[PDB]
Design a protein around this ligand. Sequence first.
Ligand SMILES: [Zn+2]
Lengths: 60, 127, 98, 206, 155, 140
Amino acid sequence: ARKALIEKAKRTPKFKVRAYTRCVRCGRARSVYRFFGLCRICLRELAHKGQLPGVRKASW
Amino acid sequence: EQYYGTGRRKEAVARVFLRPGNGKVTVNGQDFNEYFQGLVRAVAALEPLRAVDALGHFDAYITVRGGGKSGQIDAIKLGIARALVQYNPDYRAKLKPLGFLTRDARVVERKKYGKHKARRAPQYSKR
Amino acid sequence: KIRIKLRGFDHKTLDASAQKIVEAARRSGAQVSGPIPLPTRVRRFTVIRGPFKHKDSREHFELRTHNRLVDIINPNRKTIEQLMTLDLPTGVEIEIKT
Amino acid sequence: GNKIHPIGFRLGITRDWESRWYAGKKQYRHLLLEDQRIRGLLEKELYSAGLARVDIERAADNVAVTVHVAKPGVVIGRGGERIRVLREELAKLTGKNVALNVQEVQNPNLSAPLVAQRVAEQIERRFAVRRAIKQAVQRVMESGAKGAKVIVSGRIGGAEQARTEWAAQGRVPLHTLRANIDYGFALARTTYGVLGVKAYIFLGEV
Amino acid sequence: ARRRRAEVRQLQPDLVYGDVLVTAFINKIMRDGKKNLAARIFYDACKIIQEKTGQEPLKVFKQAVENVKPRMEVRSRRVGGANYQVPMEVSPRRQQSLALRWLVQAANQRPERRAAVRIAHELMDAAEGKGGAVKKKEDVERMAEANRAYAHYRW
Amino acid sequence: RAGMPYVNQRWLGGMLTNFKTISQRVHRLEELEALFASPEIEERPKKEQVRLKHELERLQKYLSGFRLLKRLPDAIFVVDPTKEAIAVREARKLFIPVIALADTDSDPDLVDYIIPGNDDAIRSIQLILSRAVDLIIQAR
RNA sequence: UUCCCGGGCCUUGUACA
RNA sequence: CGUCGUCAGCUCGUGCCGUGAGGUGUUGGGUUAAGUCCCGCAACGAGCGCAACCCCCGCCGUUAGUUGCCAGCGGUUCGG
Ligand SMILES: [Zn+2]
């Protein structure tokens, strides 16, 4: 999550297959979610904070 | 004319209509012998009838949905018991002891994280 | 002849909005089909609790959206003028259909 | 131990989301990202004001920001200069003609975030940690507040070793769903590291 | 089980014959949750028995089971760092369990190709008073009564 | 048969040295007694009512008669000084004069005003207490 | 519930920066 | 975040005991999944825990009938 990598991720990389996704909050490139654009850790933090509307702890 | 019972067992749901007749049962527009064919256990679905010396009086229309064949059989059994009770409350006094008015509450237990399937833990060795 | 589709993350506000719409419509002449509860859609996210390891923690989150139906029949002119003008709570979304 | 977030635990009941709006699969992440930007900007801007909570709402291409502040005077400025400049700043941050709204919190001693922020200020000003926590808890408990509990992380007073301080008074039943427990976190940046301040305030039942 | 007595499950009586012992035997046959297969195998074996033997298959099965019920078992016990096979009397429950399990194992160990054939043969032989099941019962009994020296370890 | 308080079920440790703490229990008793006289009990599901009633009856059992003490008593009357040695010790500690109906197995030193008599024999207790109470009555 | 492992209680001999 | 451990335990205010560390409460007997409850007791109460409050499955009810259902009932021709 070097600054250079974060910036490089946001340009048209001369190809489609060179494109990938990063956590829009911390720049993590590993375990992001398409729906939110957040990594797992940031997903958990923001879901606990109550800043993700309609999202709650599940129990079935 | 029509005496109706529901019955439920493990994702299978029945609807039984009992009408006066010769004692012929149909399931989803098919016959019992041809729907549950090759299944030994099938005839179980009819014990609540023959418990009270039925099978001479009531033709049954059966609509069954969801679950599996065995679950469907149990649903049919519960439905028939309920319909017979509705026919005459006194029937309840003799159906209930034999254990037919009970809906089996046992269903598939949900999987747990960190287990192979809901109870089975991962193997470990070489302590 | 005119169809109202209601979406929302919450069910309280969704029910309140559905009741308000159906009441305003029924009071305005034409008959109402009423609030039909459509099946809700649930998305499940399972995320490891720990930031580094311990892959056996796996907190579960769900996001559920509810769906309603109203389906007003024989649209009155005063009805069609009162609709598309009502104010919604912060969560509820309305889709219009014919 | 590893207690879970007492707000996430009660999002369903006794607590409400900070953001209330619906979005489809297509437009969820964009709305969320701009919300993140808005919260970041206001947090940076309105620190002096005593910010406690930010609420974002959307109806139809409209944003209704509601900011709960100890001192609304700081937010407005004189003749509504500051509020207007903030409104235009937000509008040009996100092109959705936002509507900034200001609320004043009654008895800021009953606001968990404000209490945590105040204690963090005390820490950054090199006050006695134990005395600060004790005074904060006493002050909170004096203003009703059926229960209170304040925790400070570690590295107390430029020490070599980290250690949790922590003080409580009253009832803090974390395990009950119908608790209406208010939680606040503050980060104190000291020349010798960082400290965490957690505040729990138990305000009635049901 | 440290506290309770672990009450035995009540099995649903058979449908063809209306007895619980047949149900237990079917269960003892059934593998991988295939119960229909076990029922078909058992009924094929019963038909074979009836076709090749005078009386009803039910009596043959029942009296074979009664014929393969041991009474003395040896249990491994630790005394003074030594392992002793203490003789014990087996309750009817354990009797029936051992009988059915041994019958099934002996049937499955036969050289006949078809499962129904093997089951029928084992049942007929155990009825007569010979075969793998009866032999194992006899060996179990003789392993006891040959070490009655340790019976005073009441256990 | 007087305005005097009494303890006859059990002497809780610190009825005198820890007077303030026990007074809280007295207040709890009065508040619960008020609550069960109210129709507002219909909330708090029946088993919660059960536990509340158990608490109330325990309080009545141990604190009936003790309810009359608004403050520290001016004297104490002990039937058996040996039996209620805890009460005697407390009263000694708090400079409260002690009157006791002692017998052969008692310590004469710890009693300020001793009546050398019997601690058993209902008749003796009846006579002594009756005379004392009548004297209190006609003294008022 | 005799033995294998672990935890708790009652009773008991050595060591805790 | 893992772990001991979903194991039942960890403390506090006033009182009492001991010069003091500390003890009692929280040692005893019955019963619990549980410091769960009861009885006694120099202690009387409380806080964090346990349990409950929240959710899912199992029975029934009111509200509502579309894109879901078809017991009635009129063509169908297989098809709700
Ligand atoms: Zn992230």
